[PDB]
Each structure stands twice: as structure tokens, then as C-alpha cells.
Paper text:
In the Siphoviridae SPP1 phage, the tail tube consists of the TTPs gp17.1 and gp17.1* in a ratio of 3:1, with the latter being generated by a translational frameshift adding a fibronectin type III (FN3) domain to the C-terminus of the protein. However, virions only containing gp17.1 are still viable and infectious, indicating that the additional C-terminal FN3 domain is dispensable for phage assembly and infection. gp17.1 monomers are unstable in solution and spontaneously self-polymerize into long tubes in vitro which are indistinguishable from native tubes. Six gp17.1 subunits assemble into a ring with the inner 24 β-strands forming a β-barrel that defines the inner lumen of the tube. The α-helices are arranged almost parallel to the tail tube axis. These rings stack onto each other with a rotation of 21.9° forming a right-handed helical, hollow tube.
For cryo-EM experiments, we purified ΔN−3 gp17.1 which is indistinguishable from wt gp17.1 as judged by solid-state NMR. Curvy tubes were observed in the micrographs. For image processing those tubes that appeared most straight were selected. 3D reconstruction (see “Methods” section) yielded a density map with an average resolution of 4.3 Å. The local resolution varies significantly, from about 3.5 Å at the inner ring where the β-strands are well resolved, to worse than 5 Å at the periphery. The inner β-barrel shows nearly no motion on these timescales—which correlates with these areas being highest resolved in the cryo-EM density. The global, collective nature of this motion does not impose heterogeneity onto the cryo-EM map since only straight tubes are considered for structure calculation. In the context of the tail tube complex the C-arm of the superjacent subunit folds onto the outer β-sheet of the β-sandwich fold by anchoring the sidechain of Gln162 into a pocket. This interaction obscures the lipophilic area whereupon the complex is stabilized, because the number of unfavorable hydrophobic contacts with the solvent is reduced. Overall, our hybrid data support a model where the C-arm (143–176) and the loop (40–59) act as bellows contributing to tail tube bending by stretching.
Residue numbers in the entry:
A (entry chain E), B (entry chain F), C (entry chain A), D (entry chain B), E (entry chain G), F (entry chain H), ...: 5 to 176
Write the structure that this text describes.
């Protein structure tokens, strides 16, 4: 069906106007908790609980902060300076009508609470509020996170690897 | 007696008007919590706890989201667009007067909160409110979820399987 | 002393007027939580804590739902239709003045909350409110639940068992 | 020092007027939680927190219900009928001025909440309220619970034991 | 006394209604491990060991798989399709009140774990679960496994054996 | 000193009232594992090792099942039906104050787990649980297991032995 | 650095006027939770959260009650009768200006809640309120709890120890 | 990326005016929980949740107390006397524009709650409030906590170490 | 160096006040397993493993039960009745400062688990718990176990030995 | 097929950038344990085994430490200083498509645990972790370990060997 | 290469300031097990196994206790009194840059568990913890354990040896 790796959250800044959708890697658990309230009276009857309510949809997105890769710096530009976020919930599996699919929203951060442990690495917890989801199922997701994530390790170069962990470079 | 597999929740959309009852497969745990309040005074006596109250009956239905099989798209059509759900709580064991039996209701979703983990696959949690259950024990349940769930694995075809996991197809 | 099996709850419907006391089989844990409040002041003194209060006695009765045996349908006739319950808390050990003994009450259900799991079987939780217990220790409990619970297994019939789990029947 | 077995709770009914102090056998964990409030002020200063408050002292006494031995029936005479309790907190170690010592009070039950499990035996939880502790350290505790608890098992009588668990009887 | 050959496990299907009791030959070791739990308590006393427990009685039955002889096909019909087993622990020695004697049960399989080695022959391990054994000393055990197991081999047929290993047939 | 044959376990049923003490023939190894717990604490000190604990003394009693000799049927009456055991750990050597000496207890069985092998004979493992051992050094042990165990074999009766293995009977 | 043993709480009664500082031994975990509030506004700005607040400093002191050693009787004289406590938080490590050091205060007990378990020994929990800590780092701590805690065990006296656990006495 | 060791909190007093940034060693877990509220109405619409709110950013900084190293005494000068703190959140990894980078703030302590256990060492918990973070990424961090944390153990001096744990001194 | 015979465990009762140190004959393997805990920390550093822990020192003392020689009855007086033991770990070789040397303690028994085998003799396992070993090198060990153990056997007494196995007595 | 000598692990440092691939000689047992997790779920169905898992492949590489040959010094530079390893699993037999073949990775050491025995020589155990193996079948393996391993020893040099064990050098 | 005799563990006290390095003779097996933990993450990727962890390096040092030779008395001064150890892992083979080489540390003892057998001699097991090993290759190891260990035995002195086992002294 749909795995815990099959869904990722493409983020886009309000000020770039560049069609790339930088999602930030090293994810963790997530959440799109869609809380829709509802009217209730009794009418001296069994109840009138059928009535609708306003929908407030939150997001608990957790990840790990890498030392560069300024998409999270755009997240902190949205939070600490004060902006909003173009928010995309896209999938990894291939559809046959579109390429992928999504739940879309213009989101605003409640809180950016990150833990700095001792043995565990740091983890950024981020809350989200959005007005209402919008099912903008689209096609191009700029595939640097779907097929690009292949093995981690690359092939070799015996005289000239000149590399730490993140593999595959020319000598100097 | 009745096992944790012996009870499933047949759903039907308000707009289909089609007698098929699409329940959505790949379930998880459930809940039909029937909270009925009660008038309580003391009357300068031991109490008047005998008095009835209004019944508000909720449902915590959890499952896993499959990439197709649009019954859950009818769930999200009822939630996100805003509709109601024809709700059926049917059993799997065979009765001797009817075929199966049920607790019935016209239900309305509070919240659709799904978790996107990392190692575990995604899980959809859904809350339900219903006015009052109605014991419409009926017969036909369109048996694609009672006897049809048999083994998962199918027989073989050695020169011509041409199949991934979900078995049993012709070569093209 | 008194074991966790030594106490069972004989139930009786308000409309049967039948002297049998059908308790329901396949129990789980229970609880008779007797919450009595108290007149609590200070009176410019150490306190007037000695004063009594109203007694509200609840019960958390859990069991497993069996596919027949309509005593639980009498429970649901008391709950969902709206009635009351004749409630008996009897013991299994043999007294020397009476046969058994009891804590008695006319009870009313708050809530009927059952869980439908996946691997665990379904479990019915039921809350109870009663005005006040009454020590009607009586004799006859119709012993189909005291001595009749003996082994589960019966002897055999090799050419003629014709039986599934619950043993001991004639050939058709 | 003082063990968890070294402290037991001698109880006495208000209506017996008999000097025996029936404590109940087969106890469980306990608690004498002494909550004394205090005048909490500031007085445009660092605080006036030195001021005293009223003392409300509770007791969470748990035990297991034996099928006879009517001391617990005197507890239920204090609770279900409605009375008060003469409450003694005595020790097991031998003093050199007295025999034993105690914290004393006239107590009143909040609640009698007992759990009836399935495999675990039943356990009676009892709450207590007292005006104020009083250090009436006395001598005689009627030693059927200090030195009498020795082994449980007794010696034998091979042609004539005629006994179940609790040993040491004559043949009929 | 009683040897390791003196006890064999006669099996019977729930669906046959045939008085034959097919045990399956080529046995290996067995086990009827009767784990009855208990309430061990401390009670500010020496202890409250009196508490009985539920009896969970398992069976480690190992044997060798023969290419026919459909008793093990009835075992796999009870396991893989999902049924139960009429279980018999009978003895080989001759009693004087009955013919033989037994510990009886209605069993359900935990696991059917068989080892396919290389040079050792294949061996089937089967776990068993029963509510409670029942001392059903009976007489007829269809003696094809008490007296009929005599040598393995037979005497001779010098002109007209015409057989493989297991001797004693007419020529074609 | 004391050999592994010098200590045997005389048993007695709770219902017999017969001074015989049936121990069982063809014993195997034993065990009286006396686990007394303790309070070990630290107290911002070196330790609070002073605390005694409850003593739970188990027994691993193994033997071989003989086809009669109903002392093991008294064991299975204590276990499979549900009773207790009068338990005796007596010695074989002669004392000068008494005849023999013992550690005594009232025991309750955890488990009765016997192995049915193939070539080794069957062996019964029995777990035991007692409140506390009691040093009841007594005299009479009904000497059919101290001096009577001499050889097994006897001399002869050349015309009229007419016996199987266990020798020494009259002709028919 | 500072161990969990390196800090102990020297207590002194208000009525003794004796320079000995009886702390009570057999400690357990502790706590000096210093809750200082703060002026909390916004002032149509980012906030005025810089502003100070009143300090309320509590102490969760847990220990085990020894049968004598009346420093805890001075604690119960402060609580149950109603007094105050001179409170010292001193260290065990040696300083090079002073001997030891302290966080000091005049404290008042909220609550004295002790648990009487079954297998665990009793444990006294005590809450503390103090106006404000005062750093009266002093020298003499009457070293019977710093260097005197050495091993617990003492040397011997083979004809004349005459002692239980707490060692080292003359013969009577 | 960024490890749990890669971020440390450089502290500076308001009164020193010394460019050293004494952070206190022996850290534990941390936290910079940035709680920013938001304007919340509905306007007879889907909602006006887009509106910003005030940011209150807290810090849970835990560490272990060392017997000297008076930076924590400057923390206690800020708390117990009443001052403020210059607060730096710097990274350990090397940047290529600056040396390191930081999140800065002028902070004020809510509470200083430390635990004194028995087996575990003491642990200081400290809460922080700050108006707003300021991204003052600077260069020099006085590298006695970035490179100087190398091994702990030093080389040797066999005739003349004269040292306890923290190694490397001259003889006297 | 030091052989397995060179170290023996002299015991002394708490109630005897007799300078004899009864050790027991026919010892078996031993053990003084000194488990001292420690503080294990990481501290955003290489570690703060420095922390000492409490020392909990056990003893696995195994021997063979001789039918008399009541030192083991003093052990069973310490265990089964409930007392403590004066514990001695002395050596056999001669020193030049003292006669012998020792590691000393005051011990308390966890468990007394002895095996009653069949063909091996019985063996007693005893667990020990001590606060802290103390290096009490002393002189006199009452030499009936250092020099007296030479052969067991003696030379002869041809007319009048009149002895069983352990030789050397007068006629009658 | 493939023997236990036919596979060797070529190692390369991250800092060398020299095309030599130093494996370290005197191998012992190895291991590439490829642990790929999975999602096994139940779904009120037969199961949902479809879920892939992350793959964590470990290496148990054991060898013997030679006194020089600095490849193991590069291992200890990766472990004790802290680096990573370019990891190679190559084969010894000659292929016809390439020269040799391999499973490749970028590895990081868990532990370096070596045993220093007495009568056996020392042995180094090393654990390995890799993100993902990659099938990099390549050609050149610098043949000092494929064809060069011929005997260990050489033929002879009768006058002028002048060598220790490892033969074949010029005089001086 | 390197034999099990080629590596020995030179010890030095923290209080001596004597350049001698007393190792203790009669070694047995050893161990320096270097457990360095790591961050193990999945990150909706192939993994983030990259994270370094803290190194906890232990030592299992076993030897035989000689009756003098106070190096082990310095070990017991570190354990039983409470100190630390200067720890040396040096090699026996000769280098050409230095004489020998080492892995060095400052160690603290977990446990000192020694076995006192019967027919085998005693053996001491000692556990070690160190912050971090440091590669301190040095020259002088006080060669009384590298070259001086030659045979054990010496040549002769035929009239005037006058010695026990370890030979080579003057007459008297």
C-alpha cells in the first residue's frame, strides 16, 4: 500500500518564486491532524449532532537538522522573522493519471521546538496550522527525492576517491 | 465466540445509491464507545440516579491507507468536502435466521488524523459521531470480505505468472 | 480466601419475571467502586470531617461477546432501548448459613464501550450506577456456573462424536 | 529499622466496646498521607509562607478479602451502613518503655473500592479521613498478629491430620 | 515401570466420526507440559500461596513424516485450514480394570515447525494447547499399534516375495 | 557424610488420614531451592542490607512413572483435580536422639511436566511451592524404604519360582 | 564532581539550641525545587518578560524511618504538633577555604506522606517550603556522618562479639 | 549533520565585561522550545488563523554540578540574587564563512530545580525565558571546549605523575 | 602462589560468643563476587564515568552436608529462623607479620539451594550478601583445619582398632 | 564452488587516496549479516507482509594482529581517532566477464574488541555497519593476495639464506 | 605475528610516584573490549548510520593471585578503598623506533570477582572502565618481565642450593 517512506512534504518559500520545491531531507515522524468541530443542540430530541463545524488542520513535522541545505533556513525565515509557507504533501508511488499526488495548503508555524540531547542527535519539531487542505494532485515533484535516493553509497574510485562519508568526488 | 476479525464496518456513501457496501480493507483496531449520560439529583434522599440521559456514540476506526480503492476517497469526500456516511457494523459469523448482523447508523466524522511514521507504514485514525444505533440485522453483505479472504496466496503459473506480490494474473 | 474467580455477577432483566438469574458467561475483570462523599468543613476548628455524604457506587464490568446467549441482548435491551437491571454480586464459595452470598442492587448503565481489536478478541466494557448496595445474601443461584464449570473437556464417542470444540453431542 | 511488615493497623468498632483490637489479616500496601495546608501570602515582601494550615490526613489501606473473619464486616458496617472507626497504627518491634507504639485516630471512610480480577485475587482498597493524629503509644496489642505469625505450617499427625491447607486439627 | 515406548498419542479428527483413532506412526519424543499458574502473595505475613491458577497444558509432539498415511494430513487439515483435534494420551501396557488408560484432551495447535535437514531425515515438531486433561480410562484402542508392532520385518517368502523392503506380499 | 540416596521425600494426601507416608519408588533427582528475598538499599550510605524477605521454597522433584502404586495418583489428585500435599523431606541415616530427621512443609504444585521419550523411559518433573520449611525431626517413617530396599533380586525357588522379573513368589 | 552521596541535609530543631546539627540518616532521594515566578506582560511589544518574580522553594526529602534516633521525632514535632525547622543543605567534599558549604533556610513542612509497603520497607516523603535560600557556608558539621560512614563492618571479637548486624560491642 | 554534542550553550554574565564566554561543562539534555502564539478568529468563514502571535521562547538546560568552576556560581548569581544572562547557542562544527554560528538571546531564569538522588549523581535543571532569538553568528568561541575536549586521558609521567583522575601534573 | 585449598571460610554465629570459628568440613567451590556499581555519564564530552558506585558483594559457597557437626545448623539458624552471620575469608599459608590473613564481613543469606542428586552426593549452595569487606588480618584461626588435615587415614591397630571407616579409636 | 579462502575483504582509508587496497593478512572468520527489517501486519486479514524495511548490514571481521603492516593502523585510525572506511568484499576466483567481483560499501566501526589469551595468540574482532551494499564488480585488486599467496615459504638458499622464518633474502 | 604472551598490562598506582610499573605476574586471559556506540537513524531514507557515539572501553583482566607482591594490593587499594589506576597495555616484541608500544588509559574498576575452586587454584577476574585509550608509545618498561622471564628454573648448585621450588639462593 503506502509505506512510511512513501509520503514526503515538499516545502516552498513565499519569496523565492522558483519552481523547485525544496523539501528538507532527514525526516522523522509527521502528522496532519485534521480537527473538524461540529454543532450540537438537543432540540428536546435525541440530538442534532449531524451539524458541521470549522476545520483546523495541524501538522507535527519532525526532522533532523543538517548543517547546511538552506531549506530549513527558509523554515526559520518563515518562523523567526515571520512569514508563511507553501506546503505540499506528496507521495512517492507512481500514479497512472498524474505522476504523484498531494494534499496542499498554505501553512503557518505555531512552534519550532528542537531537542538537543547528549547521545541522540538534535531533532527539530515543528507545528503547523492550515486553513483547509486542497487536493491539488499535480505531476512534477523535481525528482531529487524519489529516484535519487537509491543506495547512499556510490561505486568506487581506488586511486582517487578523496572522500569522507558522502561518496563519489573527483580528486580535490 | 466473536473474534477481533469477526466484526467489520461496511461503509456506504450518501451519493452512490449503489447496493454494494464498499468497506475499506486493511483495517486496524476500532471502537464504538457509547456514552449515555443521565439525570442526577439527590431530592434530599439517597439519590435519583435511575434517570436516563442522552446517548452520544463515537467510533475510533483505524486502518492503513492503500494507494487506490476509492472507498477511503469516499471517506475523504465525506470529511473534507463535507457529507455524511452510511455506517454498518456487521459480523463475519453465519447466523441461522439471517446471514449476518449489524449495528447501523448515519454517522458523521469528527476528525481524520493520520500518522506518517518512518519505519511503520501510515495509519489513518478516524472519529465518528452517530445519533443512535439501530439494530438492522440484514442478510447480504456482498461477500468480497468474508469468504473471499481465504489465503492471500494463489496457486501458480510457471511459464506465465507475470506477477508481483498480489498473485494470479495472465501473461499481460 | 476469595479468588478472582470466586465472585460472579448474576444479572436479571426487569421484564422476564423468571427465577433463573442468567449471569453472563465469558467474563473479564470487574469493579464495584463505591464512592461516598462527605460533609467537609472547618468550623474555625481542626475540621468537621466526620460528616457523611451521598454514596454513588459504580461498576466497571468487562467481558467478551459471545455470538449467541441472549443475556447480553438483555443487557443491550437495558442500555440501547432504555431499561434498568436487577444486579447481583454473588460468591462461588459455599457458606454454612446460606449457599452463597451477595451484594444486591438495582443498577443503570452509563456506557457500553467495546473494543474491536485485530489480534485480540472483542471486549465489552460496561459501566454501572446504583443507588445503594443491599446485603440480600440468598441461597439459590441455579448452579450452571459454579459446579458446571468443571473441565471443559468431556469423555469421547469414537464412532459418533460429530463435534467441534465444545464437546459431547450425539451423531446429528 | 522498620520493615514493610513491621507496621500493622489495629482496628476497633464503635459498638463492640471490647478490648481486643481486631486488625484484619492478609493486608496489602497502605498509606497515611498527611496533607497539611498553610497560609500562603506575600505581604509585599518575599512571602508570609511560614503560616500554618489545617491538617487533612488520608489513608489508602489495601488488603485481600477473606471469606469469613467479620472484622471486614465491621468495616462494611462502618461504610455501607454508615458509622466511624477507631483507628490504630501500631508497630511490631519491641520498645523498651512500652511494648509497641502507634499513631492513633478516629477515622471515617471515603470510599471502599475493591477490584475483582480474573487471575489475580480480589483486593479491597479503602480510603480514610481523620481529624488529626494522636500519639497514644500504648502497650497491649493482643498478640495474635506479632508472634502468632510464625510459619503457617505446623508439625504433623500422620494417622490423624484430616486437614487441608491451614494445618493442625484433630480428626473431626 | 513405564518405558518411552509404552505411551502413544492416538489422534482423531473432528470431522470423521470414525471409531478408529489414527495415531501417526514413526514417533519421536513427546511432551505434555502442564503449566498451572498460581497466586503467590505476601500479605504482611509469611505468604498466601493458597491461590490456584489456570492450567495451560502444552504438547511438544515430534515425529517423522511418512509419504502417505493421512493422519498427518488430518493434522495439517486441523492446522493449515483451521480446525481442532481430538487428542489422546493412551498407554501400551495392559490394565486389569480396563484394557488401557489415557489422559484425554481437545487440543489446538500453536505451531507446526518441521526441520528439513540434509542427512538426517525430516522431523516434524508440533506444539499443542489444551484446556484441561481428563482421566478417561477406556478400553478399545484399535490394536494396530500395540500388538501389530512386533518386529518390523517378517520371516520369508523364498519363491514369491517380489517386494521392496517391507516384506510379505503376493507376486503382484 | 550424606549421600544422594540418603534423603527421600515422603508424601501424604490431605484426604487419606492414614499414617503410612507413601513415597514413590524409582525416584530421580530432587531440589529444594529456598529463595528468600531481601531488602537491599543504599540510603546515601554503604547499604541497608538488613532487610529480610519472604521465603519462597520450590521443589524440583523428578521420578519415573510406575504403572500402579497410587501415590502418584494422589499427586495427580492434588494437581489435576486441585488439592494440596503434605510434604516430607526425610533422611535415611539413623540418629541417636530420633530415628530419622526431616524438613517439613505443606506444598502446592506449580507444574507437572513429564517427558515421554523414545528410548529413555518416561520421567515426571514436578514443581513444588511451600510457605516455609519446618524442622520436624520425628521418628517413625514406616520402614518400607530404608531397609527393605536391599537388592531387588532374591535367591531362588528352583521348582516353583514361576515369576517374571521381581522374584520370590509361591507357585501360582 | 558532586555525587548523589556528596550532599546531605543537616536539620536542627527550633527548641534545642544545641550546636550538633542532627541530620537524620538512612536517606533516599531529595529535591530542592526553586520555583521563582516573573512579571509577564506584552505592553504592545515583544514582551516584558524580563521582570522578576517571587521565589517559592520546595523540598522533596525522602528517607527511611529508623526505629529510634529522635531527629525524625523532631521532624514530627515540627509537623504534627506544629513548629518550624532550621534547614541546612551541606556538602560532603572538602573545600579549601571552608570545610564544607551549604544552601540554608528556615523551612516549614507542607506534608509528611509515608508509604507502608509489603515487601518494600517504609519510606517517609516530606515536602518543604522556605522563604529564600541563604548561602551561609560554614565549617563544622559535627563529623559523625562524613568520615564516620566508613565501611559498616568492624573488626571482630571472637570470644566476645555478642552482636547482631550493627557490629562492635563488649560482651554485655 | 549536527550531532547531540555539536551544539553547546555559551553563557556570559552581565557584570563581568570579559570576552571569554564561560559555558559550564558536564552538560545533559537541553531544549529551546520556541512557543509562538497566533491570532485566532473565524469571521463567519473558514478561519483567520493566518495571523501572527507573540513568541515566548523557553530553555530546558540540564547539566551536572561540579564542585568548582564558578560559571554556575554566576548562574546562581543570576537566579538567587537576581540578574539576567547573556545567552549563546553555538555550534561545534566549522563553518566556512564564520568559525561557528549561534542563536543569541538575553535570557532570564524561571526555575533552578536540581535532583539529589542516591545512586545517580546530582543534576541541575534550569528553565529560561527569552524575548526573541537573534541570529548573531559570530566567530571566536575561546576554543577550550571545541578542540580541547580531545581524549580526557593524557600521556604519562612514570616517576612523577602524582595525579588522580584528571591527569597531567608535575610532582608537587 | 595460592591454591584452591589455601583459602577457607571461617564462620561464626551471632549468638554463640565462643571463640572457635566453626568452618564446615568437605567444602566445594566458593566465590566472593564483589560487584561495585558506578556512575556512567556522557555529558557532551568523552564521558563522566568517574563516579564511584555502591559495592554489593555476594558469596557462592558450596559444600557437602555432613550428618552432624552443627555449624551448618548455625547456618540454617541464620537462614530459616532469620539471623545474620559473622563471615571470615581466611588463608591457609603462614605469613611472617601475622599467622594468617583474611577478608572479613558481616553476611546475610539470599538463598540456601541444595541439590539432592541420585548417584552424586547431596550438595548445598548458599548465597551471601555483605555490606563491605574489611581487611582484618588476624592471627589465631583455631588450628583444626590447617595442620590437622593431613591424610584422614592413620597407621594401624591390629588387635583392637574396632572402628568403621574413619579410623583410630580404642577397643569399645 | 566458493571456498572459505576464496573471499577476502579489501580495505581502503578515506584519507590515503592511493590505489592499493590494503587488506590485512592473517584472516580469521568473517561475516556480512544483512539485516533488512519489514512490516508484518494483520489488518483483520491474513496479513500485510508487503512492507519493506531498512537494511542495516553488519560485519564481523576477525583476524590476527601482525606487529607492522599499517593497514590495521588505518583501521585504528578509523576507530580510535574517528573516521570511516572504504569497504570491499572481493572474491579470489577468476571471472570471465571481469577479473573478480565484489560487494562494496562505506563502513563505520561499532566495536574493536580483541582477545589477549595466554597460549593462543591474540585475535581482533571488529564490527562493521554500512548503509547499503553495492554490487561493484570491478577488475584490478592489486594481486599481492590472490596469486602471491602460494606456499608461505620459499624453496631454498643453502649457503646464503641467513634469515629467520620468512625465507628468501640475500646474505645481509 | 603477535602471540598471547607478547602483550602485558603494566599497572601503576595513583599515589606511588615511582617509575617502576608493577605488573602482576602469573597472568591469565585478558580483554580490552572497546564499545563505541553510534547514532542509528532511518530518516525516510536508506539510513543515517553516520553518527559517532561515545566510547566505553572495558577490560576483562584475569590472573592468579600470588601470596605477596603488592601490585595486587595496589589493585585492592584502588577497588576496596576506592581510588583509580594508571593502566598500560604494552607489547613484548622489540620495535625499532621505540623499544615497545602501548595503548594507555586511566582506568576505574567495575568489579573484582575471584573464584576459589577446590582442585584448581584460585583465579581473579577484574573489570575495567576507561574514558578513552591513548596511543602512548614509549621506551622504558623496566625489563624485569620481558627478558628476565627465561625459564622459571635455573641451572644448579649441587652442595648448597638449600632452596624450595624457585631455585638460586646462597646456603642459608
Amino acid at each position: 500500500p503506502i509505506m512510511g517512506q512513501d509520503v514526503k512534504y515538499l516545502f516552498q518559500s513565499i519569496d523565492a518564486a522558483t519552481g523547485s520545491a525544496p523539501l528538507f531531507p532527514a525526516y522523522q515522524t509527521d502528522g496532519s491532524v485534521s480537527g473538524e468541530r461540529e454543532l450540537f443542540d438537543e432540540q428536546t430530541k435525541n440530538g442534532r449532532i449531524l451539524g458541521p463545524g470549522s476545520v483546523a488542520d495541524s501538522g507535527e513535522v519532525t526532522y533532523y537538522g543538517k548543517r547546511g541545505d538552506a531549506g530549513q533556513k527558509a523554515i526559520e525565515d518563515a518562523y523567526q522573522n515571520g512569514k508563511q509557507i507553501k506546503f505540499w504533501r506528496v507521495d512517492t508511488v507512481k500514479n497512472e493519471n498524474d505522476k504523484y499526488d498531494a494534499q496542499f495548503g498554505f501553512a503557518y508555524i505555531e512552534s519550532r521546538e528542537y531537542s538537543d540531547g547528549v547521545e541522540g542527535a538534535v531533532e527539530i519539531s515543528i507545528s503547523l496550522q492550515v486553513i483547509g487542505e486542497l487536493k491539488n494532485g499535480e505531476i512534477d515533484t523535481l525528482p531529487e527525492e524519489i529516484v535519487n535516493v537509491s543506495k547512499g553509497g556510490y561505486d568506487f574510485q581506488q586511486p582517487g576517491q578523496t572522500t569522507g562519508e558522502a561518496p563519489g568526488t573527483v580528486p580535490a
